[PDB]
């Protein structure tokens, strides 16, 4: 199913939808030490359309193939936008034209910014740029805002804004879109320049269900899981929960069961052929008990055993006994 | 065969007898693989040690990748070598007791009193017990004659990381690890107990490596990236 869209020559044709792990270039490799697949798999998260396909000959004489895939990004909730003054922020919500508060002339905002962002940050240049952009759109004359020398000054800009037909202080009468009722106060309107940053929420999501683990540590990574870590462990300790710590640090990662000999304490194994437990040191004569531990602890025990350190695990009754 | 909890861990030095008994094979072959790529028996990548490829039976236990704890091997060193991690401890053992008999260079009555005090408070006051142990070690290093033998004792100096130099006549001589192992083996168990160590769990001669354990394949898996050639762990 993954080779459906691959052309006969082995490279995907332009202007085709590429979803998930579709292959773009089909390559077979002979072994270094019988063909093997080194074909390109499109990144699992990324979905897009093939834009361009390029075929060339390298200097040494090898065939070089490049495939460029385009993906359309429509702004959404969580996308990061920033002005020319240092006011970075995600999109809280997308509001329809009907819901946005319209003015007497019917002009609705493209972006609404909380006034409380202004006084602590002390960015007066943003309001100055809003007024300047309003004046530039109204009068049509160029606005120069070079530091220490601006043409025209603020007062002439306000006077011309009043002359063109709007309020001198760049505010204007605003009616609530949802209810139709005029606001008790005027609202400042401007044309501040905004830029869309490349920290989109589309590629910033990392979520993991049950999946693969490492061959050595038997812990989940690559989609990889979020590391819990010491500080979150201490937060969980601080709340006093015990089964939650056990779930978050033992059940969902490197959950293992190991059979331990009673006498020497070294880790044994269960033999599938014969139901009897087997101890590496004691052979068959000793009894072995199963204990559920993190596989990381077993790895630590075996790494200490690769040293001359000899950790002997001491078993105890699971019940409180008493 | 009942599920149990872990009360604790008993730490100790792994004796050569335990290494030989626990190991499933003796590694004698230098080569790791063959010309065709099949692993060679008796080598570093012995299939007896463990299995990492899914769907492969382990010869020792018969389990798949999941359920195989990994089985240790062992290599017999021709000449004993000093474990780096224990050099300080070995150092503390060399200068405290004489080479002639291995007894602590302290009068017998004082040894009895110190042993009684330590045994009384080895567990109640670990800090006070450690202070007593360091005082005994200091007074043993200070004395340069064995009360039991009378043999003259030579100052032993440790040049980092593992070089031991003994002042014989007017010249320094390098202490061979075999001679150090003999000196440590001559030390009695009670004297080791007095020095803060546990004679049953750990013995000074076990700090000198006669047999070296070979870790299982499970903890040093051979990872083969698809683009690259087979890669082996640094271990």
């Amino acid at each position: 199913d993954y080779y459906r869209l691959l052309e006969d020559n082995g490279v995907v044709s332009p202007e085709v939808e590429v979803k998930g792990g579709d292959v773009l270039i089909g390559k077979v490799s002979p072994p270094r030490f019988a063909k093997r697949d080194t074909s390109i798999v499109t990144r699992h998260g990324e979905n897009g359309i093939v834009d361009l396909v390029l075929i060339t000959e390298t200097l040494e004489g090898n065939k070089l193939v490049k495939v460029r895939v385009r993906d359309l990004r429509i702004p959404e909730i969580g996308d990061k936008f920033a002005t020319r003054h240092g006011q970075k922020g995600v999109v809280g919500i997308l509001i329809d034209q009907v819901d946005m508060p319209y003015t007497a002339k019917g002009i609705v905002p493209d972006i609404i910014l909380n006034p409380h962002a202004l006084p602590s940050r002390m960015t007066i240049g943003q309001i100055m740029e809003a007024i300047g952009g309003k004046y530039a759109a109204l009068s049509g004359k160029p606005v120069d805002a070079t530091p220490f020398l601006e043409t025209p000054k603020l007062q002439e800009m306000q006077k011309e804004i009043l002359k063109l037909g709007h309020l001198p202080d760049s505010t204007e009468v605003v009616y609530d879109g949802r209810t139709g009722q005029k606001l008790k106060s005027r609202i400042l309107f401007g044309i501040v320049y905004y830029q869309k940053l490349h920290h989109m929420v589309a590629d910033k999501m990392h979520a993991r269900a049950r999946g693969p683990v490492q061959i050595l540590t038997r812990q989940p990574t690559e989609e990889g899981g979020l590391r819990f870590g010491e500080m979150e462990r201490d937060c969980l300790i601080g709340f006093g929960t015990a089964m939650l710590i056990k779930d978050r640090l033992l059940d969902n990662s490197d959950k293992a069961v190991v059979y331990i000999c009673d006498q020497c304490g070294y880790v044994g194994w269960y033999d599938r052929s014969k139901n009897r437990y087997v101890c590496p040191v004691h052979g068959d004569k000793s009894v072995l008990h199963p204990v559920t531990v993190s596989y990381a602890f077993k790895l630590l025990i075996q790494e200490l055993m690769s040293m001359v350190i000899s950790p002997r695990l001491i078993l105890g009754e699971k019940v409180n006994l008493g | 065969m009942s599920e149990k909890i872990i009360r604790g861990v008993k730490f100790g030095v792994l004796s050569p007898n335990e290494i030989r008994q626990m190991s499933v094979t003796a590694i004698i072959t230098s080569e790791v693989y063959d010309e065709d790529g099949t692993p060679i028996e008796g080598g570093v990548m012995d299939p007896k040690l463990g299995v990492i490829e899914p769907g492969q039976k382990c010869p020792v236990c018969g389990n798949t990748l999941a359920g195989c704890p990994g089985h240790f091997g062992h290599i017999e060193l021709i000449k004993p070598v000093i474990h780096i991690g224990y050099v300080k401890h070995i150092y503390d053992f060399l200068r405290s007791t004489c080479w002639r008999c291995g007894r602590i260079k302290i009068k017998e009555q004082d040894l009895e009193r110190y042993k009684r005090i330590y045994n009384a408070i080895k567990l109640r006051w670990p800090s006070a017990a450690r202070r007593l142990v360091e005082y005994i070690k200091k007074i043993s290093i200070k004395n340069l004659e064995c009360p039991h033998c009378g043999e003259k004792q030579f100052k032993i100096k440790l040049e980092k990381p593992y070089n031991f130099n003994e002042e014989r006549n007017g010249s320094i001589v390098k202490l061979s690890p075999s001679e150090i192992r003999d000196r440590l083996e001559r030390i009695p168990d009670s004297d080791v107990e007095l020095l803060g160590y546990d004679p049953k769990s750990s013995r000074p001669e076990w700090m000198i490596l006669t047999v070296l354990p070979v870790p299982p394949i499970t903890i040093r898996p051979s990872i083969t990236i698809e683009s690259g050639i087979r890669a082996e762990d640094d271990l």
């Binding site: 699971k318 019940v319 006994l321 | 009942s2 599920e3």
Partner: peptide, 27 residues
């Protein structure tokens, strides 16, 4: 979970073993 400790153990009565197994079969 299964800790077995035998206290004041008594010998198995061979004559009464038949009665005991009959009682067990009745149960």
């Amino acid at each position: 979970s299964y800790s077995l400790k035998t206290i004041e153990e008594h010998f198995v009565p061979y004559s009464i073993a038949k009665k005991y197994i009959k009682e067990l079969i009745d149960t």
